[PDB]
Amino acid sequence: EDIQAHYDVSDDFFALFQDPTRTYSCAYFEPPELTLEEAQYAKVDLNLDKLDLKPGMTLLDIGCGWGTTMRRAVERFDVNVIGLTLSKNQHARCEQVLASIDTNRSRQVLLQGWEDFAEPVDRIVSIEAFEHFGHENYDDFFKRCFNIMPADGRMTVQSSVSYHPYEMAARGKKLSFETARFIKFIVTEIFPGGRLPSTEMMVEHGEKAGFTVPEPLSLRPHYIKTLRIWGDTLQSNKDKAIEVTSEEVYNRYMKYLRGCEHYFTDEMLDCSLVTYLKPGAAA
Ligand SMILES: c1ccc(CC2NCCN2)cc1
Ligand SMILES: [Mg+2]
Ligand SMILES: [Mg+2]
């Protein structure tokens, strides 16, 4: 706990490498010449367009960040929204983002985890929160998501993934041990207590809960471009980043950002956008 708190970093530091929306997830460069900011909106659209959202439905955002996904959903689809975050800062910002919207739709932000959320919702989106949940909680997660949705329910989960050690060993022993050590660094120093799933885990746990799971979308090339821009931006802001934190924290995040770009490029990490369809989902 204390040792993990050593890895707490100011929101101000994150602002020195992210786009103006402060999206801390894979952008979607379609078309390829989008700015990072436009690509973060495109990634939100990529997720929401999979969810068969109709006016007056309620969308649940599990890990709602700074509220960008929820705002886009209200504005584009005329839906009610509920977001879950455990960040007090993100909670306050989401309430202000949603209050700003010209709408009669209900907007709610809860400072709580999915474990404590048991209200009926139409559709669920979760963008790069899943890596915090832990393997032993995946069955409870998919069961909760299945049970709170109607017969035509759908969910997207976007998550960074690694491969089963067996599969990693297939793509060179030297690279398997080197990748495992970097993943340990990610889930120790960058996201304390994190644990990467595999795409196969994300699929099989959904199926066991009763979801239909089509072929997941790989975002690998998009995450490479995202991490290149994040790294280039942090580096261009080096002095300011050291002033707000320390040389230690700057070096840690340069290692994270360049490191991830490398292991994504070498196809030892991936990013999967998995769609989960309830049996009564529209065709
Ligand atoms: C391990 C734990 C959490 C995460 C989620 C995440 N947050 C920002 C970008 N990825 C990834 C990997
Ligand atoms: Mg902000
Ligand atoms: Mg490297």
Distances from the Cα of 138 to the Cαs of 141, 178, 282, in angstroms?
A: 5, 27, 25
**Does residue 279 have a cis bond before it (omega within 30 degrees)?**
no
Burial class (CB in 10 A: 0-12, 13-18, 19+), 250: buried
Ligand 1 pocket, Cβ-based, cut-off 6 angstroms: 24-25, 128, 131-132, 160, 186-187, 191, 194
Query: What six digits make up the tokens of 111?
Result: 């400072």
The answer to whether residues 23 and 217 touch, using CB atoms and an 8 Å cutoff, is: no
How far is 117 from 145, CA to CA, in rounded Å?
10
Q: How far is the CA of 184 from the centre of ligand 3 (A)?
A: 14
Any idea which ligand is nearest the CA of 94? Answer: 2
3-state secondary structure of 85: strand
* Residues making up the binding site: 24-25, 63-65, 85-90, 114-115, 127
Rounded to the nearest angstrom, the gap between the alpha carbon of residue 208 and the centroid of all alpha carbons in its chain is 22
Rounded to the nearest angstrom, the gap between the alpha carbon of residue 33 and the centroid of all alpha carbons in its chain is 22
Q: How far is the CA of 273 from the centre of ligand 1 (A)?
A: 14
CA nearest neighbour of 68 among 54, 79, 83: 83
3-state secondary structure of 126: strand
The answer to whether residues 127 and 95 touch, using CB atoms and an 8 Å cutoff, is: no
- Beta-carbon neighbour count of residue 71 at 10 Å? 21
How far is 166 from 169, CA to CA, in rounded Å?
5
The answer to whether residues 79 and 56 touch, using CB atoms and an 8 Å cutoff, is: yes
What is the DSSP pairing of strand 154-161 with strand 217-218? Answer: unpaired
Residue position matching structure tokens 């690279």: 175
How far is 277 from 212, CA to CA, in rounded Å?
5
How far is 70 from 77, CA to CA, in rounded Å?
10
Q: Quote the Cα angle for 161-164-166, to 5°.
A: 150
Q: Using only the alpha carbons of the chain, give its radius of gyration.
A: 19
The answer to whether residues 156 and 49 touch, using CB atoms and an 8 Å cutoff, is: no
Mutate which of 131, 185, 226, 264 for ligand 1 pocket (most atoms within 8 A of beta carbon) = 131
Residue 99 neighbours by CB under 8 Å, 6+ apart: 107
Q: How far is the CA of 233 from the centre of ligand 3 (A)?
A: 17
Query: What six digits make up the tokens of 35?
Result: 């700015």
The CB-based long-range contact list for 4-13 (8 Å cut-off, 24+ gap) reads 4/192, 4/193, 7/188, 7/189, 7/190, 7/192, 9/245, 9/249, 9/253, 10/244, 10/245, 11/89, 12/244, 13/241, 13/244, 13/245, 13/249, 13/253
The answer to whether residues 135 and 164 touch, using CB atoms and an 8 Å cutoff, is: no
The answer to whether residues 214 and 241 touch, using CB atoms and an 8 Å cutoff, is: no
- In units of Å, what resolution does this entry have? 1.9
Q: φ, ψ for residue 63 (rounded to 5)? A: 85, 65
Structural determination approach = X-ray
The answer to whether residues 22 and 15 touch, using CB atoms and an 8 Å cutoff, is: yes
Residue position matching structure tokens 């304390």: 192
Residue position matching structure tokens 């939100």: 44
Rounded to the nearest angstrom, the gap between the alpha carbon of residue 164 and the centroid of all alpha carbons in its chain is 21
The CB-based long-range contact list for 111-116 (8 Å cut-off, 24+ gap) reads 111/85, 111/86, 112/84, 112/86, 113/84, 113/86, 114/62, 114/84, 114/141, 114/144, 114/145, 115/140, 115/144
The answer to whether residues 142 and 207 touch, using CB atoms and an 8 Å cutoff, is: no
Total length of the chain: 283
